[PDB]
RNA sequence: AGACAGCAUUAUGCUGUCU
RNA sequence: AGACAGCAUUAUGCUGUCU
């Protein structure tokens, strides 16, 4: 395993989760939803390549993002 | 005369600006991999083009995006 | 050699926004 | 009709992780 690869996957999962929440509240435009769909497929493959549950990785990404924002 | 776009087009741009800022922080702390930086560089380009088309300053949209992201994260239940 | 993701360029099809 | 961003598919060149 590569730390930065893992970290970047978990962070990408968390930001997808934020984007998904925006889309579910019907607050995004169609190209935003198009990127949502592309990235969802992409994260399934990245997670499977890494042997990581996407839900757990999303939770870890949240922790990471909170830390890097706290350090601002 | 001139019109600002629909609400959702502006919201998506502001959210993307703010999420670009979060991603950039990860890169500046050397916590990302190389493809992640590749996407960072692509999207910084695209966001400048979008902001120009929209008549919006991405530095302002970033701060708006910050508020939108926090209001939906707090409201998440 | 394979799996996976991306970037760049290309061609084709399309979506959105603005004018 | 144009500008911008994107999505899909194609081709070419790369980058990264894993086996």
Domain residue extents for chain A = 1-72
- For residue A15, give the nearest of B19, B35, B76 by CB distance: B19
With beta carbons less than 8 A apart as the criterion, state whether B65 and B15 touch: yes
3-state helix, strand and coil shares in percent for chain B, rounded to the nearest 5: 80, 0, 20
SS (H, E, C) A36-67: HHHHHHHHHHHHHHHCCCHHHHHHHHHHHHHH
Which experimental method was this entry solved with? X-ray
Tell me the HSE value of B35 on the side-chain side, using a 13 A CA sphere.
8
Return residues with beta carbons within 7 A of strand D.
A 1-2, 5, 31, 34-35, 37-38, 41, 49-50; B 33-35, 38, 42-43, 45-46, 49-50, 52-53
Resolution value in angstroms? 2.3
């Amino acid at each position: 395993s590569d730390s930065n690869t893992i970290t970047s996957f978990q962070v990408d999962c968390y930001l997808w989760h934020i984007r998904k929440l925006l889309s579910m509240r019907d607050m995004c435009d169609a190209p935003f939803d198009d990127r949502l769909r592309r990235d969802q497929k992409a994260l399934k493959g990245r997670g499977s390549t890494l042997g990581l549950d996407l839900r757990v990785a999303t939770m870890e990404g949240k922790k990471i993002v909170e830390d890097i924002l706290k350090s601002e």
